């Protein structure tokens, strides 16, 4: 339904800039990625679709130059050439400025697919030149995954807000999902730490498993586990683990008490702190202790 509406808009366009907008963590990105093949009914060769998604928190003017060079040539197999820019609010002022001509008047054969979850974060100059499209993960999809994985859906709260991870769970099915959870349960701590920073499902399950170890390790051995984790995961990796664990601790616990309100306020605050202003080990210790004691 969504993809079909876009397809029609695209087929009667002589160049178009679209912004796929949604509250889900990955649905805007996945809709963007599947769009070209949905319109063309053929899979994408690299000469016909370009994906822009830098590893950091900024999309610079250099990324915009890349896009502009790519758009100057015709597609090989496809009718149209596609550019996908994930989480486009990351564009710098120079990047946005440099992208106005191509965005307002893209080549007749071009489709620029930007995506974000924050429409108002974009400069009015981007908003003025892009056809906005709000996307929502349909109810039927949730009912479809719940029915495939059963009780595991309520046991994994992230799935309701991360479409792609919910889709990986749906592809594995009940037995393999339960089997993956058990494989991580028996895995050695050194090996488990190599997965806590992975993308998607396996990273989420590894994070859940590491938290459970901090929650259940015998009192005498808690700091031994903590030292082993903090000696392996440091700097930016530690900041990333803090962020991920804070999200899991927040979303996978209930907070009714007055004492809980102090803990929630602390957990909520961590999410908004920049890497330069946080003590990693002290923060990790506190979130894990919060979680461990909440579970007790």
| Rounded-to-integer distance, Cα 207 and Cα 225, Å | 14
Of 24, 30, 40, 63, which lies in the binding site for Na ion, with binding defined by CB under 5 A?
30
Q: Per-residue DSSP letters for 36-86?
A: HHHHHTSPPPTTTEEEE--SSS-B-HHHHHHHHHHHTS--SSSSSEEEEET
Task: Report residue 256 CA to chain centroid gap.
Answer: 29
CB of 30 to Na ion, least distance (A): 5
Nearer to Na ion, 9 or 285 (CB): 9
Task: Report residue 16 CA to chain centroid gap.
Answer: 25
Q: Could you tell me which stretch among 34-42, 59-67, 76-84, 273-281 binds Na ion (CB under 5 A)?
A: 34-42
Dihedral angle, C-alpha 98, 102, 103, 109, nearest 10 °: -160
Nearer to Na ion, 168 or 209 (CB): 168
Q: Per-residue DSSP letters for 120-156?
A: GGS-HHHHTTSEEEE----HHHHHHHHHHHTTHHHH-
Kindly state whether residue 34 participates in binding Na ion, applying the rule CB under 5 A.
yes
Task: State the residue for tokens 């063309």.
Answer: 40
| Rounded-to-integer distance, Cα 279 and Cα 243, Å | 13
CB of 119 to Na ion, least distance (A): 20
| Rounded-to-integer distance, Cα 93 and Cα 159, Å | 34
For residue 263, give every residue at least 6 positions away whose Cβ sits within 8 Å of its Cβ, in sequence order, or none. 255, 290, 294
Q: Could you tell me which stretch among 7-15, 25-33, 81-89, 137-145 binds Na ion (CB under 5 A)?
A: 25-33
How many residues touch Na ion (CB under 5 A)?
A: 2
Kindly state whether residue 24 participates in binding Na ion, applying the rule CB under 5 A.
no
Nearer to Na ion, 110 or 135 (CB): 135
Q: Could you tell me which stretch among 31-39, 107-115, 197-205, 231-239 binds Na ion (CB under 5 A)?
A: 31-39
Token pair recorded at residue 171: 């592809």
Nearer to Na ion, 31 or 242 (CB): 31
Q: Could you tell me which stretch among 29-37, 60-68, 174-182, 249-257 binds Na ion (CB under 5 A)?
A: 29-37
| Rounded-to-integer distance, Cα 249 and Cα 293, Å | 12
Kindly state whether residue 162 participates in binding Na ion, applying the rule CB under 5 A.
no
CB of 230 to Na ion, least distance (A): 38
CB of 82 to Na ion, least distance (A): 15
CB of 39 to Na ion, least distance (A): 13
CB of 32 to Na ion, least distance (A): 9
Nearer to Na ion, 172 or 289 (CB): 172
Binding site for Na ion (CB under 5 A): 30, 34
């Amino acid at each position: 339904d969504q993809l079909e509406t876009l397809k029609r808009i695209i087929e009667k366009s002589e160049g178009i800039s679209i912004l796929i907008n949604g509250e889900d963590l990955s649905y805007p990105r996945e809709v963007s990625l599947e769009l070209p093949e949905y319109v063309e009914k053929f899979p994408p060769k690299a000469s016909d679709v370009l994906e822009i998604d830098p590893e950091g928190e900024n999309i610079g003017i250099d990324d915009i130059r890349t896009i502009k060079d790519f758009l100057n040539y015709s597609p090989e197999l496809y009718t149209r050439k596609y550019v996908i820019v994930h989480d486009c609010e990351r564009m710098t002022q120079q990047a946005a400025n440099a992208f106005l001509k191509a965005l307002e008047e893209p080549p007749e054969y071009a489709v620029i697919v930007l995506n974000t979850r924050r429409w108002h974060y974009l400069l009015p100059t981007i908003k003025s030149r892009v056809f906005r499209v709000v996307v929502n993960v349909p109810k039927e999809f949730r009912d479809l995954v719940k029915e495939k994985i059963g009780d595991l859906w309520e046991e994994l709260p992230l799935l309701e807000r991360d479409f792609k991870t919910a889709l990986e769970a749906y592809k594995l099915g009940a037995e393999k999902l339960s089997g993956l959870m058990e494989s991580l349960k028996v895995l050695e701590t050194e090996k488990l730490l190599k997965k806590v920073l992975s993308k998607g499902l396996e990273g989420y399950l590894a994070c859940r498993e590491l938290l459970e170890r901090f929650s259940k390790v015998e009192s005498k051995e808690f700091f031994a586990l903590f030292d082993q984790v903090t000696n392996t995961i440091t700097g930016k990796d530690a900041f990333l683990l803090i962020q991920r664990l804070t999200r899991i601790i927040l979303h996978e616990n209930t907070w009714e008490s007055v004492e809980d309100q102090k803990s929630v306020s602390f957990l909520d605050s961590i999410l908004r702190v920049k890497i330069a202003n946080l003590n990693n080990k002290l923060t990790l210790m506190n979130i894990l202790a919060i979680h461990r004691e909440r579970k007790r």
